[PDB]
Design a protein around this motif. Structure first.
Motif, PDB file in Angstrom:
ATOM      1  N   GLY A 185       0.827  -1.197   0.000  1.00 58.94           N
ATOM      2  CA  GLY A 185       0.000   0.000   0.000  1.00 58.94           C
ATOM      3  C   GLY A 185       0.857   1.240   0.000  1.00 58.94           C
ATOM      4  N   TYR A 186       1.941   1.224   0.763  1.00 56.09           N
ATOM      5  CA  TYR A 186       2.831   2.387   0.799  1.00 56.09           C
ATOM      6  C   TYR A 186       3.428   2.613  -0.619  1.00 56.09           C
ATOM      7  N   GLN A 187       3.917   1.515  -1.176  1.00 60.86           N
ATOM      8  CA  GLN A 187       4.522   1.456  -2.484  1.00 60.86           C
ATOM      9  C   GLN A 187       3.630   2.004  -3.579  1.00 60.86           C
ATOM     10  N   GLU A 202       7.106   8.596   2.302  1.00 59.76           N
ATOM     11  CA  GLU A 202       5.847   9.193   2.684  1.00 59.76           C
ATOM     12  C   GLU A 202       4.800   8.094   2.821  1.00 59.76           C
ATOM     13  N   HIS A 203       3.717   8.413   3.500  1.00 64.53           N
ATOM     14  CA  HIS A 203       2.599   7.503   3.642  1.00 64.53           C
ATOM     15  C   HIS A 203       1.558   7.836   2.548  1.00 64.53           C
ATOM     16  N   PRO A 204       0.622   6.905   2.214  1.00 66.89           N
ATOM     17  CA  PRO A 204      -0.241   7.210   1.061  1.00 66.89           C
ATOM     18  C   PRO A 204      -1.096   8.420   1.378  1.00 66.89           C
ATOM     19  N   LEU A 253       3.341  21.304   4.269  1.00 67.14           N
ATOM     20  CA  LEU A 253       4.244  22.471   4.267  1.00 67.14           C
ATOM     21  C   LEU A 253       5.706  22.192   4.657  1.00 67.14           C
ATOM     22  N   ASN A 254       5.928  21.143   5.433  1.00 67.09           N
ATOM     23  CA  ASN A 254       7.238  20.818   5.929  1.00 67.09           C
ATOM     24  C   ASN A 254       7.996  19.854   5.053  1.00 67.09           C
ATOM     25  N   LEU A 255       7.275  19.069   4.261  1.00 61.92           N
ATOM     26  CA  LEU A 255       7.841  18.065   3.358  1.00 61.92           C
ATOM     27  C   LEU A 255       9.039  17.191   3.866  1.00 61.92           C
ATOM     28  N   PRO A 273       8.087  10.884   7.473  1.00 63.38           N
ATOM     29  CA  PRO A 273       7.785  10.529   8.859  1.00 63.38           C
ATOM     30  C   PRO A 273       8.815   9.537   9.371  1.00 63.38           C
ATOM     31  N   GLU A 274       9.013   9.527  10.677  1.00 64.46           N
ATOM     32  CA  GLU A 274       9.913   8.585  11.328  1.00 64.46           C
ATOM     33  C   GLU A 274       9.192   7.328  11.835  1.00 64.46           C
ATOM     34  N   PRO A 275       9.946   6.231  12.001  1.00 65.49           N
ATOM     35  CA  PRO A 275      11.398   6.169  11.796  1.00 65.49           C
ATOM     36  C   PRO A 275      11.634   6.094  10.284  1.00 65.49           C
TER      37      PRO A 275
HETATM   38  C1  LIG Z   1       4.657  17.477   8.076  1.00 61.10           C
HETATM   39  O1  LIG Z   1       3.285  17.962   8.005  1.00 61.10           O
HETATM   40  C2  LIG Z   1       2.246  16.902   7.962  1.00 61.10           C
HETATM   41  C3  LIG Z   1       0.905  17.589   7.922  1.00 61.10           C
HETATM   42  O2  LIG Z   1       0.076  16.919   6.958  1.00 61.10           O
HETATM   43  C4  LIG Z   1       2.290  16.016   9.162  1.00 61.10           C
HETATM   44  O3  LIG Z   1       1.694  14.830   8.833  1.00 61.10           O
HETATM   45  C5  LIG Z   1       0.369  14.799   9.231  1.00 61.10           C
HETATM   46  O4  LIG Z   1       0.410  14.912  10.654  1.00 61.10           O
HETATM   47  C6  LIG Z   1      -0.934  14.717  11.229  1.00 61.10           C
HETATM   48  C7  LIG Z   1      -0.842  14.737  12.763  1.00 61.10           C
HETATM   49  O5  LIG Z   1      -0.433  16.067  13.116  1.00 61.10           O
HETATM   50  C8  LIG Z   1      -1.514  13.272  10.867  1.00 61.10           C
HETATM   51  O6  LIG Z   1      -2.905  13.231  11.365  1.00 61.10           O
HETATM   52  C9  LIG Z   1      -3.130  12.298  12.434  1.00 61.10           C
HETATM   53  O7  LIG Z   1      -3.358  11.014  11.847  1.00 61.10           O
HETATM   54  C10 LIG Z   1      -3.455  10.102  12.867  1.00 61.10           C
HETATM   55  C11 LIG Z   1      -3.155   8.847  12.282  1.00 61.10           C
HETATM   56  O8  LIG Z   1      -1.877   9.038  11.681  1.00 61.10           O
HETATM   57  C12 LIG Z   1      -2.005   7.855  10.932  1.00 61.10           C
HETATM   58  O9  LIG Z   1      -3.068   8.059   9.873  1.00 61.10           O
HETATM   59  C13 LIG Z   1      -2.398   8.512   8.609  1.00 61.10           C
HETATM   60  C14 LIG Z   1      -3.775   8.275   7.679  1.00 61.10           C
HETATM   61  O10 LIG Z   1      -3.951   6.800   7.606  1.00 61.10           O
HETATM   62  C15 LIG Z   1      -0.837   7.407   8.391  1.00 61.10           C
HETATM   63  O11 LIG Z   1       0.679   7.387   8.004  1.00 61.10           O
HETATM   64  C16 LIG Z   1       1.352   6.484   9.259  1.00 61.10           C
HETATM   65  O12 LIG Z   1       1.925   6.943  10.702  1.00 61.10           O
HETATM   66  C17 LIG Z   1       2.957   6.169  11.811  1.00 61.10           C
HETATM   67  C18 LIG Z   1       4.433   6.830  12.059  1.00 61.10           C
HETATM   68  O13 LIG Z   1       5.404   6.781  11.021  1.00 61.10           O
HETATM   69  C19 LIG Z   1       3.320   4.691  11.467  1.00 61.10           C
HETATM   70  O14 LIG Z   1       4.173   4.041  12.494  1.00 61.10           O
HETATM   71  C20 LIG Z   1       1.959   4.095  11.080  1.00 61.10           C
HETATM   72  O15 LIG Z   1       2.195   2.612  11.109  1.00 61.10           O
HETATM   73  C21 LIG Z   1       1.319   4.868   9.679  1.00 61.10           C
HETATM   74  N1  LIG Z   1       0.040   4.219   9.910  1.00 61.10           N
HETATM   75  C22 LIG Z   1      -0.559   3.991   8.756  1.00 61.10           C
HETATM   76  C23 LIG Z   1      -1.915   3.321   8.788  1.00 61.10           C
HETATM   77  O16 LIG Z   1      -0.037   4.271   7.676  1.00 61.10           O
HETATM   78  C24 LIG Z   1      -0.508   8.611   9.385  1.00 61.10           C
HETATM   79  O17 LIG Z   1       0.672   9.527   9.238  1.00 61.10           O
HETATM   80  C25 LIG Z   1      -0.449   7.576  10.488  1.00 61.10           C
HETATM   81  O18 LIG Z   1      -0.864   6.195  10.406  1.00 61.10           O
HETATM   82  C26 LIG Z   1      -4.863  10.236  13.520  1.00 61.10           C
HETATM   83  O19 LIG Z   1      -5.225   9.085  14.359  1.00 61.10           O
HETATM   84  C27 LIG Z   1      -4.847  11.700  14.260  1.00 61.10           C
HETATM   85  O20 LIG Z   1      -6.173  12.028  14.813  1.00 61.10           O
HETATM   86  C28 LIG Z   1      -4.387  12.850  13.217  1.00 61.10           C
HETATM   87  O21 LIG Z   1      -5.506  13.342  12.366  1.00 61.10           O
HETATM   88  C29 LIG Z   1      -1.544  13.009   9.322  1.00 61.10           C
HETATM   89  O22 LIG Z   1      -1.931  11.667   8.994  1.00 61.10           O
HETATM   90  C30 LIG Z   1      -0.142  13.385   8.811  1.00 61.10           C
HETATM   91  N2  LIG Z   1      -0.263  13.232   7.361  1.00 61.10           N
HETATM   92  C31 LIG Z   1       0.408  12.304   6.681  1.00 61.10           C
HETATM   93  C32 LIG Z   1       0.136  12.337   5.128  1.00 61.10           C
HETATM   94  O23 LIG Z   1       1.199  11.500   7.215  1.00 61.10           O
HETATM   95  C33 LIG Z   1       3.690  15.656   9.510  1.00 61.10           C
HETATM   96  O24 LIG Z   1       3.570  15.085  10.850  1.00 61.10           O
HETATM   97  C34 LIG Z   1       4.634  14.120  11.227  1.00 61.10           C
HETATM   98  O25 LIG Z   1       4.299  12.822  10.742  1.00 61.10           O
HETATM   99  C35 LIG Z   1       3.085  12.292  11.243  1.00 61.10           C
HETATM  100  C36 LIG Z   1       3.052  10.890  10.622  1.00 61.10           C
HETATM  101  C37 LIG Z   1       3.113  12.190  12.785  1.00 61.10           C
HETATM  102  O26 LIG Z   1       3.991  11.051  13.102  1.00 61.10           O
HETATM  103  C38 LIG Z   1       3.500  13.587  13.474  1.00 61.10           C
HETATM  104  O27 LIG Z   1       3.726  13.484  14.915  1.00 61.10           O
HETATM  105  C39 LIG Z   1       4.791  14.119  12.785  1.00 61.10           C
HETATM  106  O28 LIG Z   1       5.054  15.470  13.285  1.00 61.10           O
HETATM  107  C40 LIG Z   1       4.662  16.998   9.501  1.00 61.10           C
HETATM  108  N3  LIG Z   1       6.069  16.903   9.937  1.00 61.10           N
HETATM  109  C41 LIG Z   1       6.603  17.678  10.877  1.00 61.10           C
HETATM  110  C42 LIG Z   1       8.113  17.414  11.183  1.00 61.10           C
HETATM  111  O29 LIG Z   1       5.966  18.570  11.487  1.00 61.10           O
END
Ligand SMILES: *[C@@H]1O[C@H](CO)[C@@H](O[C@@H]2O[C@H](CO)[C@@H](O[C@@H]3O[C@H](CO[C@H]4O[C@H](CO)[C@@H](O[C@H]5O[C@H](CO)[C@@H](O)[C@H](O)[C@H]5NC(C)=O)[C@H](O)[C@@H]4O)[C@@H](O)[C@H](O)[C@@H]3O)[C@H](O)[C@H]2NC(C)=O)[C@H](O[C@@H]2O[C@@H](C)[C@@H](O)[C@@H](O)[C@@H]2O)[C@H]1NC(C)=O
Ligand code: NAG
Length: 602
Positions: free
Chosen positions: A424-426, A486-488, A497-499, A502-504
């Protein structure tokens, strides 16, 4: 007596004219109404004389439904429509944007940006051919593709759907259209719609005008640029689309200098229709008209007036068709919108329908079901994935032995990373779910599977999603491949805005690379903060969102083919640098557009 519109041997303009002449007002507005399968019923379709249906992302019959389940659903709806007084068949649309992506088992091709990296419009045409076959395998005749936006700021959630920031490249990729529709005749006149028949689909040049030019790349926001910029940057591709016979044109949620595209008659009627002489139909986006107002849908009566007078032909409601039809019926009854407007709209919709041959073949061909996920398409996706990769670095210092391509025979290797074994990520957004999803959501090969499929049997392969530094240093590995990214995401969910990834992601790369020489595979939909990742890696490859066939990636890492892709976008040093596209004044990229290291096949 004789009904000319039912005669398949007549000219399409004669049949259109004939039919149009027999339509009541309800029938006319019904044609101009597109509703979501989720609110559809044989009665609703029949009583409302509904003219089109669509599957929104993720809107499917059942999870894991087969191709005949799709055909069965489509046919079912078709039967209601064919049972109206005029039996005018409905057209079923869907976002087949990187393959027939909502469908389980469909072949998922690389998303657009990765396709831009290939600079191969013929391969893009071939994907379009494959895609049409896979869409028709499910009984669908219309794809909401290609997205020919010219993304000018990668903070935009949809930048991956833009082939390049350079319209010259996007213009080149419109070859997806004859791929999907089949090539236009020699007799062909620009602006005229075309579909070769049943094993092809109606295409759609999308987000009419300036969607990729929004401020800060905020999705659906405003594009502040003069008319010379609009036409020099965002218009070009639309004209190529006209010479290519693109059937439909979808309107963008965005605004141009404050005006909504859904309420802009100058660009829709005067330009797109009068100037470019487009003769297909113009369709709204999902709740596109509700959105002309703030709050959205705050004055739906106004929405209808504004969008229909502006020129839109078919309205993607997609749910409250009752309200839409009532209102539009009212505006015509009150003369607010003239019958000529309506007739023009219905004229465009029938032309497309008659042309593609919908009246002659309104149902699914059970024989096309095996096209879905056909191995030959998969071999093609694999080709395109491989070709879309851009090697960004291959050695830490000019004097190092280049790491890529890796040997296939090694005592032991490590495959690590959150993206190493995650289909899915891919694949990214627009895959099975609207926003994409995580894990094994469909048929394909992850970078791990592809690695195991590639190496010598003597080569031991170790997987560790997130290994500590001591784990790698004591593993006696010859080298590692780490996949992170990146995640999907789809649409506004992607505005970022930060591009930064995500970690790790960085920590695992540093962990693995600190202990063993590594090739980092970056899965992203855009340029992202990369200097750290570059700092730790021996080689680093930008794989974009490569799709379901992960072997295309290892086809290059292992030397089976050499790297050929080149940046379809500028790689920025930082986000405060943005926007910053080729030709700019403060042009100061980390990697200029067109950048990409090469290697030779072993
Ligand atoms: C750069 O700016 C981005 C703004 O868009 C920001 O990313 C967004 O951050 C918000 C939270 O502030 C996040 O919203 C939350 O989603 C929660 C669930 O997060 C999961 O859902 C999304 C949608 O399915 C999945 O990608 C994954 O996350 C983790 C960590 O790597 C991983 O271990 C999981 O296994 C993975 N899970 C899945 C199913 O893929 C999302 O990122 C996480 O799952 C939700 O429950 C909360 O209520 C809230 O709404 C957005 O989803 C996120 N957008 C995207 C496209 O990722 C960046 O934030 C940074 O990364 C985020 C992943 C967080 O870890 C956050 O703490 C980080 O700060 C931002 N970067 C910086 C440096 O500011
Ligand atoms: C764009 O975004 C801001 C929210 O960021 C909003 O208040 C503004 O009206 C939007 N402009 C348009 C044309 O959508």
């Amino acid at each position: 007596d004789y009904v000319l519109y039912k005669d398949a041997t007549k000219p399409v303009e004669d049949r259109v004219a004939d039919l149009l002449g027999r339509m009541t007002l309800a029938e006319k507005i019904g044609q101009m109404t597109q509703i979501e399968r989720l609110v559809a019923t044989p009665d609703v379709l029949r009583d409302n004389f509904i003219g089109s249906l669509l599957s929104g992302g993720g809107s499917v019959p059942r999870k894991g439904a087969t191709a005949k389940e799709w055909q069965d659903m489509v046919d079912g709806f078709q039967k209601a429509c064919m049972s109206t007084r005029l039996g005018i068949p409905m057209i079923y649309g869907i976002d087949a944007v990187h393959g027939q992506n909502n469908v389980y088992g469909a072949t998922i091709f690389p998303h657009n940006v990765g396709l831009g990296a290939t600079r191969d419009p013929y391969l893009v045409k071939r994907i379009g051919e494959a895609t049409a076959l896979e869409v028709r395998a499910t009984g669908i005749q219309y794809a909401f593709a290609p997205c020919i936006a010219v993304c000018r700021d990668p903070r935009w959630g949809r930048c991956y759907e833009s082939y390049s920031e350079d319209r010259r490249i996007v213009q080149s990729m419109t070859e997806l259209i004859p791929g999907l529709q089949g090539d236009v005749p020699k007799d062909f006149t620009s602006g005229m719609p075309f579909v070769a028949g049943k094993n092809k689909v109606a295409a759609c040049a999308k987000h009419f005008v300036g969607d990729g030019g929004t401020v800060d790349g905020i999705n659906e926001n405003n594009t502040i640029i003069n008319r010379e910029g609009l036409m020099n940057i965002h218009m070009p591709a639309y004209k190529n689309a006209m010479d290519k016979g693109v059937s439909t044109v979808m309107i963008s949620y965005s605004s141009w200098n404050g005006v909504k595209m859904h309420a802009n008659q100058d660009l829709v009627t005067g330009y797109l229709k009068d100037t470019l002489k487009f003769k297909g139909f113009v369709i709204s986006d999902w709740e596109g008209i509700d959105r002309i107002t703030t709050p959205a849908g705050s004055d739906y009566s106004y929405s209808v007036k504004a969008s229909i007078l502006a020129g839109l032909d078919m309205i993607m409601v997609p749910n409250k068709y009752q309200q839409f039809i009532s209102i539009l019926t009212g505006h015509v009854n009150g003369g607010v919108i003239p019958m000529s407007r309506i007739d023009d709209a219905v004229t465009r919709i029938l032309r497309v329908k008659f042309t593609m041959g919908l009246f002659e073949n309104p149902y699914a061909d059970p024989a096309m079901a095996e096209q879905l996920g056909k191995q030959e398409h998969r071999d093609l996706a694999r080709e395109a994935a491989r070709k879309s990769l851009v090697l960004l670095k291959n050695g830490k210092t000019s004097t190092d032995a280049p790491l890529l391509p890796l040997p296939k025979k090694a005592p032991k290797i490590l495959v690590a990373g959150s993206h190493a074994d995650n289909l899915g990520y891919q694949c990214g957004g627009w895959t099975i779910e609207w926003q994409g999803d995580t894990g094994r959501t469909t048929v394909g090969t992850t970078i791990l599977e592809a690695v195991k499929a590639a190496v010598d049997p003597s080569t031991v392969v170790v997987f560790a999603e997130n290994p500590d530094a001591e784990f790698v240093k004591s593993g006696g590995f010859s080298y590692a491949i780490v996949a992170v990214g990146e995640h999907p995401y789809t649409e506004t969910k992607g505005d970022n805005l930060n591009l930064t990834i995500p970690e790790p992601g960085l920590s695992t790369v540093q962990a693995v690379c600190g202990g063993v020489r590594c090739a980092t595979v970056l899965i992203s939909g855009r340029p992202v903060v990369v200097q750290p990742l570059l700092a730790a890696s021996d080689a680093l490859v930008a794989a974009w969102l490569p799709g379901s066939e992960g072997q295309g990636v290892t086809d290059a890492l292992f030397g089976d083919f050499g790297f050929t892709g080149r940046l379809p976008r500028t790689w920025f040093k930082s986000v405060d640098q943005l926007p910053m596209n080729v030709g700019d004044a403060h042009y100061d990229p980390l990697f200029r557009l067109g950048y990409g290291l090469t290697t030779n096949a072993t």
